[PDB]
């Protein structure tokens, strides 16, 4: 049978890939980073508390200038805050209140929203009338939208629940490229610092490295035992970290093309909703369903601190560009900034 | 206030106006009845709309209230990854057809749309997000059931079924079977209703169920329970 022959070929190729991956493993990160001094205890205190949302907060993104911030809640509101003074710069009402996404343009002129309506809405902030209009409404996905990650003022990526990713040209309003290959829902996105590649992590417990300019998968990383909800690049763009539903973070390496480190503890059993990296790449911050966040020494896997100030699940987590502060947003409609 | 420039007090003023508008909107939206419409492939989720992809929203007003109904039938994605978005809806309206006790689905083999509806109802009822949300169960398509139970008995829907072959007893058996699978009877109960083709009994029943649900949520905000 030709189908049987193709299945045997696929199995043989998977075995060859596994053997090649094994043959290039001589040591481990835990066996190499064994003589460096531990970071110690990372103690952080809340310095701002941004209130005003009246429902669960589902996403949040920092501004490139590290002062302005955007948050999306399920009461049908996108709020743009000035973190230094806690003032409400903007408040945008949404056509559909089922929103779990936020994106801030690198230039700062646009914001992007998406949710259960399968539509990516692009809002223009700098108008000649003092308003915030809906610049675009990109449609074409057949499942809910979960991450945007603006590229330029005219290019946007999208990850949706129909097991596909897309690259859209905003001006024309149509899909430029489509990335396929996942066998389950996709809830993640993270672009490389140079914005030529990106990674997605889906619900089939696998992550994929896509090339933006060619629309084809390069590498696939496995190892998790449940759905993946978070993903982020290492600052130098040569490794990434994933968070899933089995109470475990995992650091994978692009060049060696295999897993590097596992971050887990015995008395943690909940899921992980967010993942972010410190400015130097030494601290890994992960928000859990225990209503709090944990800090892991990225090179030794030892827990270095706990941020517990929320009365419900921690759903969004981010770090400023210059690494001054970390913002966490939870389902009690409160954002907190820790320094 | 004594260390702010002339352009910062105006920013504070704008923020305060934004806050006041947000509070007014939140006050307006806190007195809205929210219903989540659930069912099966074809059970009556369309015809129910006659009374008056992604989310589908319907708005209407019965006496003085603002009822909103959310329909999720085209959402073919994984239900576990978004069902928590509806934790807090006033009621869940579950539609079940009574003429699906002898019809197979496209899978053929051994399927019965009554049993699949039973599994979906059980999964929805025992969800961790809906441990205190009232469920209004509609049993649609009763006129055809009559006809079917005259010639075809309730033979292939429950192998252990025993008793007379009549509309009333069979309907009571189906209703009791559906009222089962709810292992929270202490702090939850279903609002069963055999739909009658009059277009006004259904809305009265929904209004009564919503009124009782609001009464039992106004006993917990005012420290009486």
């Amino acid at each position, epitope marked *: 049978s030709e189908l049987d022959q193709l299945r045997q070929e696929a199995e043989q190729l998977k075995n060859q890939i596994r053997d090649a991956r094994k043959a290039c493993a001589d040591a481990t990160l835990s066996q190499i980073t064994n003589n460096i001094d531990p970071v110690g205890r990372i103690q952080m205190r809340t310095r701002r508390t941004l209130r005003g949302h009246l429902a669960k907060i589902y996403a949040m993104h920092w501004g490139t200038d590290s*002062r*302005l911030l955007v948050s999306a809640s399920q009461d049908g509101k996108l709020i743009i805050w*000035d973190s230094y*003074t806690t*003032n409400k*710069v*903007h408040a945008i009402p949404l056509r559909s209140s089922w929103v779990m996404t936020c994106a801030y343009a690198p230039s700062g002129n646009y914001v992007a929203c998406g949710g259960l309506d399968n539509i990516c809405s692009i809002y223009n902030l700098k108008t*000649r*009338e*003092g*308003n915030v209009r809906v610049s675009r409404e990109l449609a074409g996905h057949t499942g809910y939208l979960s991450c945007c990650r603006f590229l330029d003022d005219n290019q946007i990526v999208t990850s949706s629940g129909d097991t596909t990713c897309a690259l859209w040209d905003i001006e024309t309003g149509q899909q430029t490229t489509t990335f396929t290959g996942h066998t389950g829902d996709v809830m993640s996105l993270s672009l490389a610092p140079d914005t030529r590649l990106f990674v997605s992590g889906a619900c089939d417990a696998s992550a994929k490295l896509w090339d933006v300019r060619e629309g084809m998968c390069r590498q696939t990383f496995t190892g998790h035992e449940s759905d993946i909800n978070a993903i982020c690049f290492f600052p130098n763009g040569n490794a990434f970290a994933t968070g899933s539903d089995d109470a475990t973070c995992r650091l994978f390496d692009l060049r060696a093309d295999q897993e590097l480190m596992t971050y887990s503890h015995d008395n943690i059993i909940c899921g992980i909703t967010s993942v972010s990296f410190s400015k130097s790449g030494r601290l890994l911050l992960a928000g859990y369903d225990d209503f709090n966040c944990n800090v892991w020494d990225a090179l030794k896997a030892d827990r270095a601190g706990v941020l517990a100030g929320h009365d419900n699940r921690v759903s969004c987590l981010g770090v400023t560009d210059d690494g001054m502060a970390v913002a966490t947003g939870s389902w009690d409609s409160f954002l907190k900034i820790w320094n | 206030g004594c*260390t702010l*420039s*002339a*352009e*910062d*007090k*105006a*920013a504070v*003023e*704008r923020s305060k*106006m934004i806050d006041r508008n947000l509070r007014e909107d939140g006050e307006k939206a806190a007195r809205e009845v929210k219903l989540l419409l659930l069912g099966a492939g074809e059970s009556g989720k369309s015809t129910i709309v006659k009374q008056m992809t992604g989310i589908v929203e319907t708005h209407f007003t019965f006496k003085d209230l603002h009822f909103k109904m959310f329909d999720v039938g085209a959402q073919r994605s994984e239900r576990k990854k978004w069902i928590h978005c509806f934790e807090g809806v006033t009621a869940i309206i579950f539609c079940v057809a009574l003429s699906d006790y002898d019809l197979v689905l496209a899978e053929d083999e051994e399927m019965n749309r009554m049993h699949e509806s039973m599994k979906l109802f059980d999964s929805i009822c025992n969800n961790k997000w809906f441990t205190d949300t009232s469920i209004i169960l509609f049993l649609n398509k009763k006129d055809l059931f009559e006809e079917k139970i005259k010639k075809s008995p309730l033979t292939i829907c429950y192998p252990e079924y025993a008793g007379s072959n009549t509309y009333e007893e069979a309907a009571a058996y189906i209703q009791c079977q559906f009222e089962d699978l709810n292992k929270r009877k202490d702090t939850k109960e279903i609002y069963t209703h055999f739909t009658c083709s009059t277009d006004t009994e259904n809305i009265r029943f929904v209004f009564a169920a919503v009124k009782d649900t609001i009464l039992q949520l106004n006993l917990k905000e005012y420290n009486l329970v």
Partner: single-chain antibody
Framework: VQLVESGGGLVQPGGSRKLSCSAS????????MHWVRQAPEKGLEWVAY????????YYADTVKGRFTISRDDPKNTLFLQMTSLRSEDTAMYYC??????????????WGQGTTLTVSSSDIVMTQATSSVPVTPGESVSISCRSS???????????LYWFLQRPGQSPQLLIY???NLASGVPDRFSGSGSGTAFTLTISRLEAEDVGVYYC?????????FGAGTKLEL
């Protein structure tokens, strides 16, 4: 976007008058509004300000108790009611919009003018050079100077540069001493220190001839600077 003003005309010494701005093309309810008057052959002079939502109101020292500022958001109208007019109220009044938040550009759009003719401390900003002879294709420099220091503790230096062409409403060029208003060519540049500022026109043209004013936005009196006329 436009503001059209009605009223003006000839008045007797001692009386009443009313000026109105009708604004079309923008969200009038979100913009604070200023009335600014210019004498027949003198520089601009701030008159009155009303906030958004009418929460805050400010009047100049010269016109207080006899001038009133009012707003009508449903009808998109701004009123100024003047009573007991002296002979010093003969001027041309302009309607200005200003929106304040982090990163905004106040004073960006100046309406047209309406003329009133009656028939009969505060920061001081200095513009030393009253007139400057210039030729196209060269570089020019205009400098202002304030009695106090406009550098606040939050790092913002509040200084604005306006250009009034021969027979037109003033146009905003620089806001907060280093930023460029939208639609202004990149050859305009402004800088300076906490007390002495400057404006640089890299390559002059035939449309840059006019009068340049420096204004402060630290304390709400809003003093203006004298004129520095550029001529061919």
């Amino acid at each position: 976007v436009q503001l059209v003003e009605s009223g003006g005309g000839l008045v007797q010494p001692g009386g009443s008058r009313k000026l109105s701005c009708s604004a079309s093309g923008f969200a009038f309810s979100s913009f604070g509004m200023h009335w600014v008057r210019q004498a027949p052959e003198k520089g601009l002079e701030w008159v009155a300000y009303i906030s958004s939502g009418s929460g805050t109101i400010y009047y100049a020292d010269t016109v207080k108790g006899r001038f009133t500022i009012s707003r009508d958001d449903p009808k998109n109208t701004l009123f100024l009611q003047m009573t007991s007019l002296r002979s010093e109220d003969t001027a041309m009044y302009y309607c200005v919009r200003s929106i304040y938040y982090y990163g905004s550009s106040p004073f960006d759009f100046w309406g047209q003018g309406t003329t009133l003719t009656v028939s009969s401390s505060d920061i001081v900003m200095t513009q030393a050079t009253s007139s400057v002879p210039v030729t196209p294709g060269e570089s020019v420099s205009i400098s202002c100077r304030s009695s106090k220091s406009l550098l606040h503790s939050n790092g913002n230096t509040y200084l604005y540069w306006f250009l009034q062409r021969p027979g037109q409403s003033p146009q905003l060029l620089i806001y907060r001493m280093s930023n460029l208003a939208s639609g202004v060519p990149d050859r305009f540049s402004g800088s300076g220190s906490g007390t002495a500022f400057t404006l640089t026109i890299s390559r002059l043209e035939a449309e840059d001839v006019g009068v340049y004013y420096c204004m402060q936005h630290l304390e709400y009196p809003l003093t203006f600077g004298a004129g520095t006329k550029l001529e061919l």
